[PDB]
């Protein structure tokens, strides 16, 4: 969760709303196991 | 006693998969920069 520790303070004549971009990744001790088939994309017919 | 990784045919591409050369070098995708940045440092100083 992301909370406002303090406010988002701006001077006059500057946008009061901005964006935060989150970039996710793994650490050096990351590991995977038991390779399987994904469920991301489906197919109902050959691509001919 | 393991009896595997033996090729029975004259052509080398007939051998089984080469699963004894695991190498990990993530620096070419995670730190593709010129000036190496120390972890404990402010990157843009």
């Amino acid at each position: 969760t992301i909370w406002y520790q303090t406010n988002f303070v701006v001077p006059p004549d500057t946008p009061t709303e901005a964006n935060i971009i989150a970039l996710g990744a793994a650490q050096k001790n990351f590991t995977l196991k038991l390779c399987k088939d994904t469920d991301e994309i489906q197919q109902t017919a050959e691509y001919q | 006693i393991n009896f595997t990784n033996i090729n029975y045919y004259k052509d080398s591409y007939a051998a089984s998969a080469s699963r004894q050369d695991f190498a990990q070098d993530p620096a070419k995708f995670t730190r593709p920069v010129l000036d190496a940045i120390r972890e404990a440092a402010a990157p843009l100083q």
């Binding site: 500057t14 946008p15 | 620096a27 593709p32 920069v33 010129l34 843009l44 100083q45």
Partner: protein, 249 residues
């Protein structure tokens, strides 16, 4: 142990200075190099016009707007009609080179927004079909969208990079951000990446160069509205072989 904010890139008779620079991305940690004799296949002696073609070319300037989607270029295609590089690409069948792409976008400390500058190898452009089966013309993109030239082409669906792949994972490619609060330029040095030592600079485009606004440009009334984005590139270690009559396309 850190990176300085100022930088100067000098190649050929051109020099680019920047005072708010993040770093310089060396794609895949490999510098551009000439084709080694161990990997070459053509027997003709290549030509290496050192300083006449390996130099910075300021090519196109697009105006960043609040509803902009982004633009993309193809590296060999964007330089095929400019300078001594364009001539050597037209007169020779074979060509290979790296490049140093430099995207410039400055704004006041009162603007905001972030661009994603990535160099995509083999950036095959997709067409979005309206669910039509019978292999209509709208199944393949026209030549204006695959080889945009020096003007570039603005994205239709930046969310899928106009290629069906998610934009969020485009950071797997050599990339850099232009965050207006942090830096005003993005530098990417890219070596020659191809399954062949040489290739035609006219048919094959080795890299796609995308500039996509992730966080839209926002400012308040009174600030400068026209915020341009300039693309400057420079071939590195460019060779050509197979001389013949100049071929345009």
């Amino acid at each position: 142990g850190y990176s300085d904010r100022v930088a100067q890139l000098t190649v050929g008779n051109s020099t680019i200075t920047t005072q708010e620079a993040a770093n310089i991305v060396l794609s895949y940690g490999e510098w551009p190099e000439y084709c080694p004799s161990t990997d070459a296949t053509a027997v003709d002696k290549p030509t290496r016009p050192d300083v006449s073609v390996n130099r910075f070319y300021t090519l196109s300037t697009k105006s960043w707007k609040t509803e902009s989607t982004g633009w993309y270029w193809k590296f060999p295609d964007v330089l095929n009609d400019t300078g001594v590089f364009g001539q050597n690409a037209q007169f020779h069948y074979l060509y290979r080179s790296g490049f140093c792409m430099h995207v410039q976008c400055n704004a006041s400390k009162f603007h905001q927004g972030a661009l994603l500058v990535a160099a995509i190898p083999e950036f095959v452009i997709a067409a979005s079909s309206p669910a039509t089966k019978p292999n209509s013309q709208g199944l393949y993109p026209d030549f204006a969208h695959t080889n945009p030239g020096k003007d570039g082409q603005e994205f239709r669906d930046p969310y899928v990079l106009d290629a069906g792949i998610p934009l969020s994972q485009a950071l797997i490619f050599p990339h850099q951000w232009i965050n207006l609060r942090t830096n005003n330029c993005a530098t990417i040095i890219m070596p020659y990446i191809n399954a062949l030592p040489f290739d035609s600079a006219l048919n094959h485009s080795n890299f796609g160069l995308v500039v996509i606004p992730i966080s839209p440009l926002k400012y308040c009334n009174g600030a400068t509205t026209e915020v341009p984005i300039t693309l400057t590139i420079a071939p590195l270690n460019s060779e050509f072989s197979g001389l013949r009559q100049a071929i345009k396309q």
